[PDB]
Structure formats: structure tokens, C-alpha cells
């Protein structure tokens, strides 16, 4: 295909990804500034310098304008806007939502998008407003799906296959389920702009998640209209990958000032709570008296900086497994948004499938909501089993009482609350009892049998490290998180002790030789994997005959490993050869 | 009389202020960058251009050095630093904390300070560590106090009188108490560095509060050694006015990067979550390539931009009455900071004493913690009596049940939680019962008796605006808060119905004439005022005989009107004359 997309880092149902469109590579989450064909508040050439590798414009507005049209047909949007990154373009659907009708056929704008050398296109999907009559939502959804099919047969460039269905979650699941079967590269989530403008974030959350539940996990998700910093953290935590903002410009023309926590009127500002190129050298008292053109141009730039800045913040958060903490923080920005944050944590089932097994950061109890974070409810249940068998419970700030044997392990030992948690180191006689517990906790039921007869080496400190058995190393407890890193010799033991498909990732006959030699496993070569597998889990690489080929760490979840056709499914530690 | 301090604005127990010394002005909260006489990562002249109008140095270090000592006496720290702002200077008592004994007398450095042109000095107060034995905390405190007395005598310049009772609330109270009755202009709160470094914010909160309860409200409070953006919001909310940072540079020397939510290691940063002049043009990798010196510079400059920016944000927050929201947001930066926040809300008594009675902003329900904000707690108590009489309860998102009569008054009507609160308009019979309920609420017990024989006129929207009797205007329900604004007649009636000192602001013999007309009352002419008075409450201006002179609105709390010698106390609406 013409669009590649692979996962590089994650946290929550969120992910930092590498997206390649016909040669142009971009890193997501990304926000594409909306540029107006006529009044370009900020020249595309400048957005380019600022670091925006993807922008978006209106095919329709251009199509309907004498000059714009001739220019686009004459030089293509790229030369016309003098921008060289990814130029996405919209169909006019938004105009179709605002005005109820539009003077162009679904076939016409698609053809036109091709004639002007657009990078990514969009067909005339119908944005059913929120709360609209169920009949209308259904009728309009079929016309949408209808045009989708057409677009699928005439498209020669990458395209947006927008998910509609107004406020009915079953319709979103349907729309997403069907569009995912077709050949489209990116999946926007439409019809939410009205909700965003009404601060009805809880509805946006329900709408987004129902769509994410039914979409193929391997295609980018774009949240149409979401162009205000205030939702970036939350949306990304949900799995949104792309945003488009016109607000940075529209607000500027209205002397309105963006902030990661909301918006402020220029006239209500006494100070500039920012340090961007604009705010670091100008004052509100000054801005206020400058020409309207200079005032807009300046607020525009600032708004873009704030946008660029939160996105950067979100990504750095993901890189350190602290996305939830950031969401929690941004949740205090507004009642409605707090409501939405609480709502998002209810979807534990959805969020748990992708929630990493281990993070670089520590579990911070920084609110009541943090007690409902995915990593907490999961660590709780997996624990029940262990505690009842190993007893010797100890007190825990966050979890309450957790066996002293899981106390050196994430998230229990790698967490902090109001009161410091006192880790309980092993004793020469204890050692193994730990590894057994951890094994049982990390690998599931029965997993301890693979280590019973093992000797545990303790470090200069009372810490479990090398887990050996008459000869070589089975595993090793990681200092950074108290979980086990498998040695080929331990993978073998786990492999025989646990029944297939447990911990397994089945690979191509073609991939086989590579695993054996130790190379990492790429998703496209994965034919099947244990559904229970979560990101960063220890994994048993195997062939269709369940023959151990190598052992490593997963980057995707069992299900993703199957769907994905790009990226690495497994980082391999050691191969059998 | 060599240092003025006035409150320009406020929110919570925090306040934006005007601090004038040596004819030099600076606004507060303000953070003074610590300048090491010897090594200087970023030059004072540079710091000044950036915007730091006040800075602090180590006189003792300048003293124990031939080179510096010389240039200091020769040119006075102002030229020796090429800095034309307010130069504060520390005694070296901090070196006394890190080692156990400096080599200079309390008298020696005080005099040296006088001789080098210092704008604000400090005496040799002893910083007892956090959890010291009470005997030591007490021993040292007395020594601190004796040196305090000497400083008071031989003082010739403005000076810092550091509250210093270790972690003993009773000792902090005593110390603050005794230093307030003495002649000093600024009161630092000391010995909390170890606490801060240890992220022990709950402890720092107790110390700061127990101190602010004993200090006289009219003097600047400096929280010694706190130079990390992370405590700013919190600290200012408790009424701290000055900060000093050495960390901006000390951190830059260990490649440590600052954030409003904590600190990060450069070799652990993929992206820069900032748009400052540095992060605006370099990437983390680019910054790691540069030589160790350029690297330190740029980081230090970044840290300073973060510091400067958090301050503008806190000040802008105070200005719009959203300072608690900000604190709540920042409370999610770390478990221990979340702990402090919760503890800070436990001090209702202290906090309530300064929380205004009416804010421009709306009450936001953004967390469990916000239901315990002063404004809420207060409103809940004051209404208990109104519901019990007037009844007509209605379901409210934050207070649960509230008499429909307060439903139009702050902070009930102007709130917002996960859900909206429909405003219950009055009929024409209710008309009065709303004014009565408000009066009983706003002015307290029995105040309603001043508005029985009154008639309430309803404007366009069925809202009660003006109250009259015999035709003359008593008071008028402010539309933006549902709080009554008194008119000379309304006051005359509250004056007789309510027992002295209720609502009274007793003024000077000199000021009596002015208040008679309508001129504003200046805090320095106030001999005594009702302790119950809160910022923006309706107040009755009167003389020692309790004769009504005029009505106005308080800009300080009762307690404050008394101690303050600078600034307005009551914006007089109209006089009796
Ligand atoms: N809401 C909303 C939208 C804004 N632009 C859009 N563009 C397309 N194609 N579809 C949509 O739903 C929307
Ligand atoms: Mg696959
Ligand atoms: Mg006074
Ligand atoms: Zn800015
Ligand atoms: Zn920066």
C-alpha cells in the first residue's frame, strides 16, 4: 500500500508512531494546522519552519474558487502553498455539516484531489450532528458507507475513511467495523466538532472509544476538529493519532488566547503564562494596542506554539510512561473535562489490552482517579491469586496488602503515594519463593513450576538477580522493575510447563531462520499470538509446530501482533541457535 | 519605614503585591535568582534584562574573600555586580547549616552589609534542621532571637528576620510572634531546604501555615531556598511572597531540566516540553552535543524561563480568581505534592480568614479536593441557618441541597460540576425572601431584619436588582454574584439592627471628615475593624463613637485593615454627609 504506520512507543491506548505517506515520514501524535486557501493567517512556508510536517486544506473551497482552482490545477497544492510536507485535504463535509448541502459530488472532489497532487484525500462522508434523530444518523451513515465504496474503487492516493453515526455508539461500532474491512489507510472520527465546542468531552470520549473498539488497531485515528491543546492528552490516551486545528487561527482573529488548560480573552490577560517567541518578548498590555493584523498574526503564532508544545509534552509523557499522570493533571482544567477523564477510566477492558506490562516511570498515587488507572486494577487481580498462595501479606499505600513476595515487583515496589512503601527484601531461604511469585504473576497460572528447583543469586544488596539451575541462567530479576527477563534456558522451561498458546507468538516459515539466529520478529511475519500478551511482556517465539525459536520482549499486544503488517512485534533477546 | 509593601490583588491566602525599597519597585510573588559571587553561570546584568528586578547574594562569601571584600567596599555590590535592581544579601547562616559554624559574628556581617550598599540584609539566624531534638530547636531559636535583638539595635538598612522553629509548630508560632513585635520589614521562613529537597511538601505546609498565623499580614514572607517552580502555586496559595533559587543553575550543572511539574534528566529527554528561547530552537539531542559549558548555560536559561513563566501563570491565576484551580492542577505533579495540597486544605480556619467573599470566576468542581476549598466550606456553613429557616431546597451539584433563595447568589448560582445547575428565578412574593436570605447570608445573623419593610423590583430578566423602602434605596442585588450592595440607608439600618462591632471599620479622628463625604478609607487611618470582615464584604465606616460616617467595600480582611499602614482599606461607596 501507499501508507505505512508502525508503533514506536506507547502508554495507555496511546502510541507514538511512525507514519509514511508516499515517501514522506512523520511522527505521531501530530496535529495538522488548518490553512485557509484565501486568508492564510500564517504562510504554509512558515508552518513548515515551525516544524509542522503535515497540514490540511479545503478541497471544496479551492474547487469552488476561480483562482484557487486554476492555481491548484496549474501547480498542484504543493507549489501553490509552497509547502513540501504532507498536505492532507478535506472534502467539504464540514461545509456539508454547517450548511446542510454542498455543490459537488463525492466522485467529483475525489477526482479533483487527484488532479492537484494531494498527499492524503477525503471523500464526502456525511457528518451527522450529535443527538440527531436515529433515522437521520442511519440514513446518512449508509450514504457515507456508499460513498466509501465508490472512493475505494477510484482512489489512486491515500484516503481518509471517516467514522460517523452521531451519538449512537452501536452505529460507531458498525461504521468502524465496516470501514476497517475496506482498503483505506487513515480513519478519522467525524461529527464531534459540535461536542468539542460545547465542552461535552464525555460524549467525545464515548464516541471515540466505541470507534476504537471496532477499528483495526493498525491504522491511524484522526479526530476531526479537535484542535485545542486542552484535549490532546486525553485523546492521545484514548488512541487518537492525528488532530486538525483551525482554532489557532480563528481564535487569533478573535483576540482569543490558547492555553493547555483552556482559552483566555486577550483583554482579560494581565500576564502571558508562556515563554514562546511571542510571549517571551511581548506583553498583553502591548498586544492589545497593536494593529488588528499584527494582533492576529501574533496570537496565531502563540496558539501554534502552545499546540506544538502540548503535543511535545504528551509524547515525552508517553516516552516515560507517565501519560495518565498528565491526563489527570489536564483533567483539572475544567469540570466537563474532569467528567470525561472519570468516564475514560471506566473502560478498563478496552484500556487494559494495550496498557504496558511495565513502564520506565513509577506508579504515582496523585488523586482518587489514579486508583482506577489500568495498571492498578490489573496488578490487583493478578495479585489475588498470588497472595492467597504465598501469604505473608504486607501493607501497601496504594494496594493495601500485597504478599511480601511481589513487593520488589512493579507496580507495587515501583510506586509512591502520600506515605512511603517499605519494600521487603528476601532472605537466603526466601529468594526462590520470590521468583516463583513473580513468575506466577508475570507469566500466569502454573508458571512457577519452571523455577521451583532454582537457586537465586543475591546482589551486594539483598536483591534477587541471576536465577540459575544446575548449569545456566534461567532468568534474571530486573532491578528497574522487579520482573523477570527470560534466558533461552528459562523460555524452554516455561515452554514445556505452560500449554500452547500461552506466551506464544507463532511466526512464518520464512521468519523461522531469523528467530533462530536471534533477529527481532516483525509483525508481518506473525501468523498468530497468545491473546493474553500485553506490550513489553516476556514472549516465547515459536513456529507453527510450537517449536521454540527464540525468546524476547513484545512491543505489541497479542492481537496487534496479528493485525499489524509493519513494525516489530518482538524484540529478541536470544535465539535457540 | 525603609520598605513599603501593599496588596494590589489577591486570591486564597495569596496576593500580588507592590514592594518598594530604596525607591526601587518590584511586584510579588517574585523569585530572586541566587547569585554566587564567585562562579556565575548567568551574569546579573543578563538576569536583569531577562526581567529579574531582585536578586540575592552571599555576603558572608564576599566577606571571607580578599578579592570580593575589596571590590565590594570599593564599589558597593551594585557596581560589583553590574546590577541596578534590588540586591538582597544573605548572612551566611546557610553555610552555618551545611557545616555547623561560620567564622563571622552576627554583628560583623550586619555591618559589612551596611558598608557594601546592600538594599536588604539578613542576620545570622540559625537554620535548625527539620527533625531536630526539641532542646536543640529551642536552644538555637533563642540564639537566633538574641541576634535578632542585636540586629534591631544596630540595624541601619532593611532586614530579613527569619522565622525558625524547626519542625515544631509551637516554636514557629512563637518565633513569628516575637519577630513581628520587633522592627523588621521582611520575614523569611527558614530551615525548610532539607524538606523541599526531600519532596516533603506536607511538612513545609505545616511550617509555613503555623508561621503565617503568627506573622503580621503586612510584611513580605520569603520562603528561603525554594527555587523550583513546583511549589510556587502551592506556596503562594499559603501567602508566600518571595522565593529565591540557586537550583536554576545548580541543576543546569548536572544536566537537570526544570518543569512546572518536576525535574528531568537531559539524557532522558526525547522532546523539550517548552517553547522558551532555548527549547524553542534546540532539540534534546542538539543540546547534548554542545560542550559542557554551553550546555549548562542554555539549561540554566531554560530553568529561569520556566521559573519566570510559572510566576506569570500564578499571578494571572490570582487576577482571575482561579488560583485554587491552578494549585489543584499542580497538585498532580507528585504524590508528596498531592499530600501537601490535601493537608493545606485542612487549615480551613487560616485560609478562610483571607478568602474573599465574592470572586469574578465561577466555582469549578474539578476534583474531590475542590469540595473542600475555602469558598465551599464557608458557603456550606453560612447556609445551614438559611435552609433551616427559608427552606425551599433545590438539588445543587456541589452543596447538594440549598435554599432556592441563595440559588442566585455566589458561589451557588455560578458553579459548574459534571452537570449544570439550573437557576431558580423568584416570583414576586419571593422577591423579598431572597433579599432576606441573602442578607442573612451575606451580612450574617439577623441582618435580614434590616430588610423586612422593603420592596424588591425585578428587571427585564426576572432577577431582583434594587431594594427600596419609603421610596429610598436600601441596597441593590449585584447581578454578577447575587450579593447585596448597600446604599447609605441600607447601612444605617444594618448599623442599628446589628450590634457593634459588626461590619464596622473604625476610623481615625483625622479621617472622619473624608469618610463623611465619600473619600476612601486608608488602612493607616483604621484603628480597629470587625474581625469577621472579609475582602470585598459590605462594610460600615464609622468613628470611635460608632457613628455611621459612610458605606463601602472592604479591600482587606478586618484583621488586615488594622495592621496595614499602606493602601486603601475600604472603597467608600457614599458618605452620610
Ligand atoms: N465534526 C467534524 C468535521 C470537521 N471536518 C470534517 N471533515 C470530514 N470529512 N468529516 C467530518 O466529520 C468533519
Ligand atoms: Mg501480522
Ligand atoms: Mg491601620
Ligand atoms: Zn505564547
Ligand atoms: Zn525551555
The torsion angles phi and psi of B561, rounded to 5 degrees, stand at -50, -40
Residues B437 and B410 in one domain: no
Chain B positions touching A315 (Cβ under 8 A) are: 270-271
According to DSSP, the β-strands at A3-11 and A14-21 are antiparallel
Looking at the structure, tell me whether residues A38 and A111 fall in a common domain: yes
Identify the CATH number of the domain in which residue A545 sits: 2.30.130.10
Q: How far is residue B208's CA from residue B241's CA, in Å, rounded to a whole number?
A: 12
Residue A430 and residue A314 share a domain: no
What's the grid cell of residue B496? 442599628
Judge if A126 and A149 occupy the same domain: yes
Q: How far apart are CA B65 and CA B58, in angstroms?
A: 11
DSSP 8-state symbol, A291? -
Question: A340 exposed, middle or buried (CB, 10 Å; 0-12, 13-18, 19+)?
Answer: buried
Per-residue DSSP letters for B211-240?
HHHHS-TTS-EE-TT---HHHHHHHHHTT-
Contact B333 A336 (CB under 8 A): no
The catalytic site residues of B sit at: 90
Give phi and psi for A432, each to the nearest 5. Answer: -50, -45
Helix (H) or strand (E) holding B570: strand B568-575
Query: Is the CB of A367 less than 8 angstroms away from the CB of B261?
Result: no
User: Which residue of chain B has the CA closest to A304?
Assistant: B275
A335/B417 touch (CB, cutoff 8 Å), yes or no: yes
- Which is nearest to B164 in space by CA: B207, B113, B202, B131? B207
Q: What is the CA radius of gyration of chain A?
A: 26
Nearest Cα neighbor of B160 from B201, B202, B214, B106 is B106
Q: B276, A271: Cβ pair inside 8 Å?
A: no
Q: Do A403 and A387 touch, CB atoms closer than 8 A?
A: yes
Instruction: Read off the CATH number of the domain in which A464 is found.
Output: 3.10.450.90
Closest approach of chain A CAs to the CA of B251, in angstroms? Answer: 20
H-run or E-run covering B376: helix B374-390
Q: How was this structure determined?
A: X-ray
* Cα B248 to ligand 5 centre (Å): 12
Task: Report d(CA A187, CA A142) in Å as an integer.
Answer: 17
Query: How far is B340 from B207, CA to CA, in rounded Å?
Result: 11
Structure-block grid coordinates of residue B334: 507528585
Same domain, A375 and A516: no
Residues B293 and B323 in one domain: yes
Name the residue among B420, B414, B377, B419 with its Cα closest to residue B399: B377
Task: Say if residue A421 is in the same domain as residue A435.
Answer: no
List phi, psi (to 5°) of B222.
-110, 120
User: The C-alpha cell of B165 is what?
Assistant: 522553629
B444 CB neighbour count, 10 Å cutoff: 17
Which triple of cell numbers denotes residue B65?
574573600
Residues A435, A391 within the same domain? no
Q: Are B54 and B84 in contact (CB under 8 A)?
A: no
**CB contact at 8 A, A142 and A149:** no
Host H or E run for residue A297: helix A292-319
Q: What is the CATH number of the domain that holds A404?
A: 3.90.1020.10
The span from the CA of B330 to the CA of A205, in Å, is 24
Q: Are residues B342 and B367 in the same domain?
A: no
- Using the 3D structure, point to which of A328, A355, A382 is the last residue of a domain: A355
3-state class (DSSP) for residue A477: strand
Residues 6+ apart with CB under 8 A from B217: B559, B560, B563, B564
Ligand 1 centroid, distance to A96 Cα (angstroms): 9
**β-strand A568-575 against A548-554: which pairing, if any?**
antiparallel
Rounded-to-integer distance, Cα B329 and Cα B80, Å = 42
Contacts of B109 (CB under 8 A, 6+ apart): B59, B60, B63, B91, B92, B123, B124
Q: Which ligand is nearest to the CA of B564?
A: 3
CA nearest to B363 within chain A: A335
Q: Please report the number of interchain residue pairs, chain A to chain B, with beta-carbon separation below 8 angstroms.
A: 118
Domain-terminating residue out of A425, A446, A466: A425
Q: Which domain holds residue A21?
A: 1-355
Q: Where are the alpha helices (DSSP H) in A374-462?
A: 374-390, 431-443
How many domains, in total, are found in chain B?
Answer: 4
User: In this structure, what C-alpha cell is assigned to residue B493?
Assistant: 439600618
Of the candidates A393, A370, A377, the residue with the CA atom closest to the CA atom of residue A322: A370
With contact defined as beta carbons under 8 Å apart, do A409 and A482 qualify? Answer: yes
Of B274, B328, B342, the CB nearest to A309: B274
Which CATH number characterizes residue B183's domain? Answer: 3.20.20.105
Domain closes at, from A447, A476, A499? A499
Q: Answer yes or no: do B398 and B473 share one domain.
A: no
Q: Do A50 and A69 lie in a common domain?
A: yes
Cα A17 from chain centre:
8
Block residue for cell numbers 501567602: B239
User: If contacts are CB pairs under 8 Å, which of residues 434-453 in chain A contact chain B?
Assistant: none
Q: Do B337 and B384 belong to one domain?
A: no
Window 322-361 of B, Cβ < 8 Å to A: 325, 328-339, 342
Amino acid at each position: 500500500k501507499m501508507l505505512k504506520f508502525e508503533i514506536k512507543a506507547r502508554d495507555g491506548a496511546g502510541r507514538i508512531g511512525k507514519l509514511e505517506v508516499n515517501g514522506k515520514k512523520i511522527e505521531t501524535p501530530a496535529i495538522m494546522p488548518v490553512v485557509n486557501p484565501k486568508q492564510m493567517v500564517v504562510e504554509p512556508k512558515e508552518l513548515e519552519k515551525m516544524g509542522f510536517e503535515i497540514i490540511i486544506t479545503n478541497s471544496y473551497i479551492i474547487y469552488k474558487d476561480e483562482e484557487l482552482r486554476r492555481k491548484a490545477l496549474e501547480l498542484g497544492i504543493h507549489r501553490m502553498l509552497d509547502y513540501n510536507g504532507i498536505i492532507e485535504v478535506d472534502s467539504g463535509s464540514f461545509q456539508l455539516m454547517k450548511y446542510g448541502s454542498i455543490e459537488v459530488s463525492n466522485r467529483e472532489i475525489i477526482e479533483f484531489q487527484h488532479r492537484i497532487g494531494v498527499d492524503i484525500g477525503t471523500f464526502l462522508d456525511i457528518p451527522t450532528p450529535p443527538d440527531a434523530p436515529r433515522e437521520q444518523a442511519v440514513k446518512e451513515l449508509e450514504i457515507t458507507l456508499s460513498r466509501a465504496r465508490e472512493a475505494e474503487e477510484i482512489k489512486e492516493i491515500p484516503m481518509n475513511a471517516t467514522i460517523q453515526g452521531s451519538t449512537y455508539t452501536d452505529l460507531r461500532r458498525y461504521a468502524a467495523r465496516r470501514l476497517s474491512s475496506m482498503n483505506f489507510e487513515i480513519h478519522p472520527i467525524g461529527g464531534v466538532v459540535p461536542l468539542l465546542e460545547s465542552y461535552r468531552f464525555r460524549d467525545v470520549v464515548d464516541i471515540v472509544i466505541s470507534s476504537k473498539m471496532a477499528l483495526r488497531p493498525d491504522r491511524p485515528v484522526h479526530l476531526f476538529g479537535a484542535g485545542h491543546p486542552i484535549v490532546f492528552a486525553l485523546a492521545v490516551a484514548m488512541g487518537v493519532d492525528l488532530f486538525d486545528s483551525a482554532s489557532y487561527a480563528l481564535y487569533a482573529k478573535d483576540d482569543r488566547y490558547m492555553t493547555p488548560e483552556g482559552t483566555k480573552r486577550l483583554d482579560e490577560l494581565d500576564y502571558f503564562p508562556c515563554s514562546c517567541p511571542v510571549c517571551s518578548k511581548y506583553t498583553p498590555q502591548e498586544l492589545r494596542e497593536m494593529p488588528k493584523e499584527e494582533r492576529t498574526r501574533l496570537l496565531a503564532l502563540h496558539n501554534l506554539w502552545v499546540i506544538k508544545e502540548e503535543i511535545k509534552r504528551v509524547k515525552q509523557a508517553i516516552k516515560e510512561g507517565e501519560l495518565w499522570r498528565l491526563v489527570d493533571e489536564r483533567a483539572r482544567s475544567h469540570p466537563k473535562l474532569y467528567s470525561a477523564y472519570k468516564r475514560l477510566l471506566e473502560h478498563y477492558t478496552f484500556l487494559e489490552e494495550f496498557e504496558p506490562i511495565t513502564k520506565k516511570s513509577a506508579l504515582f498515587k496523585i488523586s482518587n482517579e489514579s486508583l482506577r488507572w489500568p495498571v492498578v486494577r490489573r496488578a490487583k487481580e493478578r495479585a489475588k491469586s498470588i497472595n492467597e498462595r504465598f501469604g505473608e501479606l504486607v501493607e501497601h499505600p496504594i494496594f493495601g496488602r500485597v504478599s511480601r513476595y511481589l513487593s520488589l515487583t512493579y507496580p507495587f515496589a515501583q510506586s509512591e503515594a502520600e506515605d512511603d512503601f517499605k519494600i521487603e527484601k528476601p532472605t537466603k531461604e526466601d529468594a526462590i519463593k520470590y521468583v516463583m511469585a513473580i513468575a506466577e504473576y508475570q507469566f500466569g497460572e502454573g508458571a512457577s513450576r519452571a523455577f521451583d528447583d532454582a537457586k537465586v543469586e543475591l546482589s551486594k544488596t539483598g536483591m534477587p538477580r541471576q536465577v540459575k539451575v544446575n548449569g545456566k541462567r534461567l532468568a534474571t530479576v530486573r532491578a528497574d522493575d522487579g520482573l523477570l527477563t527470560l534466558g533461552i534456558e528459562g523460555a524452554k522451561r516455561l515452554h514445556r510447563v505452560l500449554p500452547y498458546p500461552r506466551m506464544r507468538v507463532v511466526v512464518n516459515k520464512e521468519a523461522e531462520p531469523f528467530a533462530r539466529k536471534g533477529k527481532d520478529v516483525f509483525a508481518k511475519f506473525v501468523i498468530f499470538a497468545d491473546p493474553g500478551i500485553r506490550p513489553y511482556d516476556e514472549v516465547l517465539v515459536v513456529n507453527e509446530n510450537d517449536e521454540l525459536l527464540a525468546t524476547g520482549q513484545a512491543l505489541l499486544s497479542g492481537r496487534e501482533m496479528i493485525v499489524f503488517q509493519y513494525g516489530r512485534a518482538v524484540k529478541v533477546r536470544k535465539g535457540v541457535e
